[PDB]
Amino acid sequence: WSAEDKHKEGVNSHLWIVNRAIDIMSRNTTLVKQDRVAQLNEWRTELENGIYAANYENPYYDNSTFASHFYDPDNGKTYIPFAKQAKETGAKYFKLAGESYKNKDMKQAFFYLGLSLHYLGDVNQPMHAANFTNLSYPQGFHSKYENFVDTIKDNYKVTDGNGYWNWKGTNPEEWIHGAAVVAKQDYSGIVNDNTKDWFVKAAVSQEYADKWRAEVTPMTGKRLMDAQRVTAGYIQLWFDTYGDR
Numbered sequence: 225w226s227a228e229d230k231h232k233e234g235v236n237s238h239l240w241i242v243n244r245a246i247d248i249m250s251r252n253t254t255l256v257k258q259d260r261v262a263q264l265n266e267w268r269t270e271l272e273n274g275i276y277a278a279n280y281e282n283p284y285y286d287n288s289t290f291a292s293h294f295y296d297p298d299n300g301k302t303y304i305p306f307a308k309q310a311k312e313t314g315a316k317y318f319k320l321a322g323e324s325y326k327n328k329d330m331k332q333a334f335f336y337l338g339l340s341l342h343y344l345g346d347v348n349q350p351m352h353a354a355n356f357t358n359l360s361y362p363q364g365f366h367s368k369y370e371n372f373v374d375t376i377k378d379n380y381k382v383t384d385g386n387g388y389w390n391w392k393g394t395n396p397e398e399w400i401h402g403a404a405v406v407a408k409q410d411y412s413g414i415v416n417d418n419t420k421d422w423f424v425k426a427a428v429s430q431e432y433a434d435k436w437r438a439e440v441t442p443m444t445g446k447r448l449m450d451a452q453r454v455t456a457g458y459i460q461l462w463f464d465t466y467g468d469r
């Protein structure tokens with residue numbers, strides 16, 4: 225997903241997903257301790273820095289190849305042989321964030337959590353769970369799709385307090401893998417002969433530009449809503465794990 229601006233949801237789908245997940249936690253009045261939401265907002269600057277940094281600097285963006293932002297649940301690999309993938313990388317920052325938290329280094333803890341949330345967010349994007357990059361055919365489709373998502377995401381906000389609490393085990397890797405499994409299933413709903421064909425013809429015909437956008441919207445809405453619920457459960461897990469007990 226996009227992450228063009230560090231603090232603006234308008235062009236940062238990653239930030240939007242996290243903010244909506246926090247809203248889910250805020251709406252939940254039977255399980256979530258609201259002081260957890262207070263802490264996230266207190267260290268929002270560091271959190272947002274982490275969400276953003278993943279796409280703009282080393283080692284997070286792997287020398288501009290973003291290899292660590294991809295993870296195919298079927299073979300457990302990213303799109304470049306032997307490179308690090310989203311599951312191990314996302315889990316790495318989830319744990320680093322927790323250790324910092326336990327040591328009262330809030331700035332470090334929330335920056336790392338932000339990074340971890342970025343990776344979790346990415347595997348919810350079908351293309352990232354299928355190793356379909358901006359260089360995959362049709363070239364350029366990956367980025368144009370994520371840019372389009374920013375224009376319609378607000379129509380798919382989750383408005384209840386039901387996050388996927390304890391969705392998977394206590395191991396963050398299970399959460400990232402689980403999200404990728406579901407996302408890859410919805411891959412064909414976004415990338416297929418039709419959308420590929422229309423995207424290419426969209427170059428000369430606005431008529432076709434509207435066609436592929438419409439075609440991928442339903443599945444996009446579903447993916448965005450799932451991403452919100454999973455992220456809320458992931459954050460809740462982080463606090464249950466490192467928040468004393």
Ligand SMILES: CCCCCC(=O)OC[C@H](CCP(=O)([O-])OCC[N+](C)(C)C)OC(=O)CCCCC
Pocket residue numbers: 225226227228279280288289290293346356357358359366367370
């Ligand atoms: C020269 C143009 C750069 C565009 C690159 C791009 O759109 O990357 C998207 C994801 C990046 C992970 P993401 O979080 O979904 O990033 C989206 C936003 N952004 C690329 C602007 C940082 O990575 C790839 O597809 C790898 C191949 C790169 C080809 C040059």
Ligand SMILES: [Zn+2]
Pocket residue numbers: 225226227238345346
């Ligand atoms: Zn992304």
Ligand SMILES: [Zn+2]
Pocket residue numbers: 225349352366370
């Ligand atoms: Zn992407």
Ligand SMILES: [Zn+2]
Pocket residue numbers: 225278279290293342346
């Ligand atoms: Zn990314």
